[PDB]
């Protein structure tokens, strides 16, 4: 049973007349049983989209080149550069102090302009993705020989043949709310780093970086990584504000991550509401041995595994007695009707009273001391 591999588990049982059951959460496990039926474990395995939509690209490190400066004397008009009307450039117009000392006929303010071509460094890009509601995959799995059923809006019902156990509706509209989420993917390198983050839409749009849409050549607001120095006569420096990776990652401290499987972008949170259509004798006492000796489960119960070497299938004669009275079974069985099957069976979970008890499985025995509350 898959639900014996984790504590996150629910239990559903169908009575006489129940041929259907109704909210899976991503990463859980539901054990479903029913009158005259085999036991199945059901869970929401994955929520994802292959090749999701992109919003903005942001640049973390400006690639500045071809710095040019033009200047004029106080009454020689305005200074000008070709780059002021070109794309992919950042320019600043200012005024410097001109006079006889720096080759002007007059003393006063002189027009000056500095331009630089602003590109973006390789692998210094940050892409935000969003999900398309008609392309989100909800994959659910069932096991007794595991089978898989994936769901989408135009295909919400799948019938599975469970190997040899007979045959067994997930509403995609009853799943995850992805209205304000953007998946943040940086380029790759820096030794190692998360492949993606889950950030709020507002926060993403307010990112103070150069930005563009996929396929564009020129970066918008490229001046966000450019600092112009003070004007000095006929000069004015263009400075780079540096690599913003560290800045960003600090902003991402405390933020939830996501996952990229090649082309498939996975959520780390979610659920789906579904509807499922659902359509012995005693074990030889002398043939049990311990596979895993009775031990503390970690959640206030006792667990064990046994190996049985008699006729299969059969029902396990498990009981426990407290030191003091060997007539009365003190085992509160959590594993209902423990049974050895042809392919599986043998795991038992029980709860015992505080004190020195003896656990029995057929004639196989083991002492167990239960701690008080």
């Amino acid at each position: 049973s898959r639900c014996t591999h984790l504590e996150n588990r629910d239990f559903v049982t169908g009575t006489q007349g129940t041929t259907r059951v109704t909210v899976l959460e991503l990463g859980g496990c539901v054990t479903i049983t029913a009158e005259g039926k085999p036991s199945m474990d059901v869970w929401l395995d994955a929520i994802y989209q292959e090749n999701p939509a992109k919003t903005r690209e942001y640049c973390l490190h400006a690639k500045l080149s071809d710095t040019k400066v033009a200047a004029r004397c106080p009454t020689m008009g305005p200074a000008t550069l070709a780059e002021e009307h070109q794309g992919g450039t950042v320019c600043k117009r200012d005024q410097s102090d001109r006079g006889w000392g720096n080759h002007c006929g007059l003393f006063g303010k002189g027009s000056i302009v500095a331009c630089v071509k602003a590109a973006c460094e390789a692998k210094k890009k940050a892409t935000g993705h969003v999900y398309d509601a008609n392309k989100i995959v909800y994959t659910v799995k069932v096991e007794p020989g595991r089978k898989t059923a994936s769901f989408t809006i135009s295909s919400e019902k799948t019938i599975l043949t469970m190997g040899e156990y007979g045959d067994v509706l997930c509403r995609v509209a009853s799943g995850v709310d992805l209205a304000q989420t953007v998946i943040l993917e940086l380029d790759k390198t820096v030794e190692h780093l998360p492949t993606a983050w889950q950030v709020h839409r507002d926060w993403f749009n307010d990112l103070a970086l150069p930005w563009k849409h996929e396929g564009a050549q020129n970066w918008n607001n490229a001046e966000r990584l450019v600092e112009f120095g003070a004007p000095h006569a006929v000069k004015m420096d263009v400075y780079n504000l540096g690599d913003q990776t560290g800045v960003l990652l600090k902003a991402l401290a405390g933020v939830p991550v996501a996952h990229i499987e090649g082309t498939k972008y996975h959520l780390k949170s979610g659920h789906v509401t579904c509807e499922v259509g659902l359509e012995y004798t005693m074990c030889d006492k002398t043939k049990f041995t311990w596979k895993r000796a009775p031990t503390d489960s970690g959640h206030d119960t006792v667990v064990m595994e046994v190996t049985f070497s008699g006729t299969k299938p059969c029902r396990i004669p498990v009981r426990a007695v407290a030191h003091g009275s060997p007539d009365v079974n003190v085992a509160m069985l959590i594993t209902p009707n423990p049974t050895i099957e042809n392919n599986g069976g043998g795991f038992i979970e029980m709860q015992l009273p505080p004190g020195d008890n003896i656990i029995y499985v057929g004639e196989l025995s083991h002492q167990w001391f239960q701690k008080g509350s």
Partner: antibody
Amino acid sequence: QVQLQQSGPELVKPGASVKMSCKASGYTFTDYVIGWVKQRTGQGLEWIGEIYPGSGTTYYNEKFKDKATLTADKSSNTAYMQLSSLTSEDSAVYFCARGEDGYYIALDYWGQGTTVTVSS
Amino acid sequence: DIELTQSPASLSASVGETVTITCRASGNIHNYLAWYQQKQGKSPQLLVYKAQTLADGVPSRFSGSGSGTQYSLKINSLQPEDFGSYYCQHFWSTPPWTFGGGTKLEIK
């Protein structure tokens, strides 16, 4: 009275296979385990394996897990042991024997034995 | 696995006397050990099961005994039909249901 009737002796060459039978007479076939035991000439007894004919459940000694295969036919009350790829090491008397399904604590009835001789 | 060591390996004794053979289990077999008698070229017969219970048809002079890991079989007033090979075996907890090597009992 309970009787386990085994098949006749086999003389086969190396690499050949034999299939021997055990027929149950005088008891409810499916309520008892059939166990197979090897005995080389003048040697001890060695447990091979066994089958619970009411459910088809089998157990095999690791030593013979690839040598022997056990089957059983409920309708004729007959169990079978088939021995594959024989060598001189398989020359021996093979016994079938009865055990109580549910309290399997002894082999209380034994067949007469099927002798297998592997030879040049 | 369980190993069953039989002791003595062999012994020679005469009619009317008493002999005792033993079977030592490498691990605890909770008294699920049976004894079988085998004559030359014949099929094994069940004598004792569950350490000390005689099988149907077996003479009172056969005493099954012991416990835990040390078992024994004692034969009072040996008769001619008692001579043969004696085997112990065990059906506890998990296979293989190993046998002992056997004790060989003969006349004088």
